[model samples]
Target: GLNYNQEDFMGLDRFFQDAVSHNNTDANAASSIEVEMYECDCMYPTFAEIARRSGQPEIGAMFDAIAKEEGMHAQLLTKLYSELEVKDSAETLEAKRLVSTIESQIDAVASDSRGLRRALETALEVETIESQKTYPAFAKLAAEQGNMEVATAFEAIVKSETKHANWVKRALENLLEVA
Candidate 1:
């Protein structure tokens, strides 16, 4: 069963709570960083699947590149987290619990062209919201906590996410042209 409650989708609130309650600032920051990276990673797989279904190899290749970059982002975050002496829990149970709603949404969208477009639109919406509101707030918090390195890393990621959103927006525009 999937949880699609409002609270389930409120990533910012989850992040804030994690930040405030965790004993290790570094761990909290690292988890947030990895969450963003995990999103990027999951995005590639979703886009690639869509591209395959749509018979759009070029677009699939683009998504592949995006996925690779996301992998790099994960690596960078991992390194940073290690440097900060923090460890993320390997208890996939809680992590899966947190993302159940998003997972259901992705599953729903993975089967058809329209659904794929909807998924991409959803992705764009999520990224836009995060880039404009959540990530910046997190960065500010990191800065205030003397985690300037995390702040800088988050700013860079926000820029990248914004670029990805632009690319998806253009893709959506192009799709409408053919529709």
Candidate 2:
């Protein structure tokens, strides 16, 4: 195992950026398709449940909404990929280079209420990435398949993430105030 203090997030933080910039193979979309579904189906629920159990009702509610929106993203991507039909799945160890960090961070935050702020920060970072970079690339690629509706769907996701980020930011502000 690496020294925890020496842990590097340089590559880990930008996996989505790296992914969307890759050559537009169907495989490119394949990974994201699975990732979207995975976040909606699995990751988001965990986040919501943990936040809820951690006694952060407001934060938990935000996570729940994020989860719901994530589910919508998965549904849209699933439909797009249904016609495109590339088989792929999300990774727990390599996702967005965030697999390990995200897993540990989520668990850490869930286990300790003190970690709520960290979770919100993490959520903000990821939502910013999706809003600014990842989904736009996805929208562009969806156009390659000549499906404007799918492209629009990805755009909508970007909007939702922007809103999601704002919600987390507000909660984080309130959290700091109370502390």
Candidate 3:
């Protein structure tokens, strides 16, 4: 029931195709996207804390909410990725490395406002990609794989992440209203 898919979501990166590929055992295919959920849960709350302690409670509150949603995503994916019978695919490994690379850049920003801006911008990008590109494909793949449960999870997250993208982008627009 996800309307978002490769048809209109955007991008043709082979890595995305592989990352969402259903060409694997039940074990690997289910958890392949957990790397993304992991990154979101970990990074968003960290940014929230950074914003909270740095005197930007509005930004902090927004991020905190995003963190909670992201955490839910990870928690549900945990059962899928938690017990693995095989090594993660090269796609998953690279996905982790890619997330970390973006995180490293966000961390490199030395100022709170600057860092928050960077992190929020990064989050907006992440959420858009998830809502538009990744989750849709993964959901479709999951549905095709007969993993309707995970497919439902992905669709729910797409709705959540779309809200988060709007939330974070609103923070950008109301930069003056916040501080």
Which one is best on lDDT?
Answer: 2
Report lDDT per candidate.
Answer: 0.58, 0.64, 0.61
Q: Give the alpha carbon lDDT tens digit for every residue of 1-179 in model 1.
A: 56755542233122111212244446556666555455555545555666666666666676677667656655666767766543345532354454454455544444556645654565567567766766667667778888878778868767876777787787767765773
Q: Once superposed on the true structure, which residue ranges of model 1 sit more than 4 Å away at CA?
A: 1-25, 83-111
In the range 1-179, model 3's lDDT, one tens digit per residue, is 87755431111121232234445435433553454454455566666755665567888888777777776775666655566443455765665554455446543432435655565666777777878887788777778879878778778877887888888888878864634
Model 1, residue 56: distance off in Å is 2.3
Give the runs in model 3 whose Cα sits over 4 Å from its true position. Answer: 1-22, 25-33, 79-82, 85-112, 176-179
TM-score of 1: 0.66
lDDT string for model 2 (123-175, tens) is 67777888888878877887887868767877887898789889878988886
* TM-score of each prediction: 0.66, 0.70, 0.65
Off by over 4 Å in 2: 1-22, 25-28, 83-90, 93-114, 144-146
Q: Which whole-number lDDT from 0 to 100 does residue 52 have in model 1? A: 61
Which number leads on TM-score? 2
Per-prediction count of colliding residue pairs? 0, 0, 0
What global local distance difference test value does model 3 have?
A: 0.61
Q: Whose TM-score is higher: candidate 1's or candidate 2's? A: 2
